[PDB]
Amino acid sequence: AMGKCPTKVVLLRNMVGAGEVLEVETKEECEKYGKVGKCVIFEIPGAPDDEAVRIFLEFERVESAIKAVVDLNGRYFGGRVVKACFYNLDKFRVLDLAEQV
């Protein structure tokens, strides 16, 4: 599974439903793990409520991404259980953000 392979890009699922609108706020929260290159919120218009909103964080170093996944996977956030994993760097760069993880 793509989600298990360590990269600089972290995918956060089930952090919020559709919607609200966060990119600056999540990015600011994830600075504790290290420098964040960018943050992309992608909404799948399907879609199960715990998979509708994908939040991507590209860290400047892989160390920061790993720390974030370990710290946030399984975390309780406003009644929701967050799923954190890695995402393929190449897929992220061409904005192919709907891949199975």
From Swiss-Prot:
Q: In its UniProt record, which GO terms are filed under biological process?
A: alternative mRNA splicing, via spliceosome; mRNA cis splicing, via spliceosome
Q: Which UniProt keywords apply?
A: Acetylation, Isopeptide bond, mRNA processing, mRNA splicing, Nucleus, Phosphoprotein, RNA-binding, Spliceosome, Ubl conjugation
Q: Which residues form the RRM domain?
A: 9-85
> Where found, per UniProt?
Nucleus
- Mind listing the GO molecular function terms for this protein? RNA binding
TM regions (residue ranges): none
A Gene Ontology cellular-component term: spliceosomal complex
Instruction: Please indicate if the UniProt record lists Ubl conjugation as a keyword.
Output: yes
Record note on quaternary structure: Binds SXL. Associates with the spliceosome. Interacts with SF3B1, SF1 and U2AF2.
The task this protein performs is described as: Splice factor that binds to the single-stranded 3'AG at the exon/intron border and promotes its utilization in the second catalytic step. Involved in the regulation of alternative splicing and the utilization of cryptic splice sites. Promotes the utilization of a cryptic splice site created by the beta-110 mutation in the HBB gene. The resulting frameshift leads to sickle cell anemia.
* Protein name per the record: Splicing factor 45
Organism encoding this protein:
Homo sapiens
Which part of the full protein is shown?
A: 301 to 401 of 401
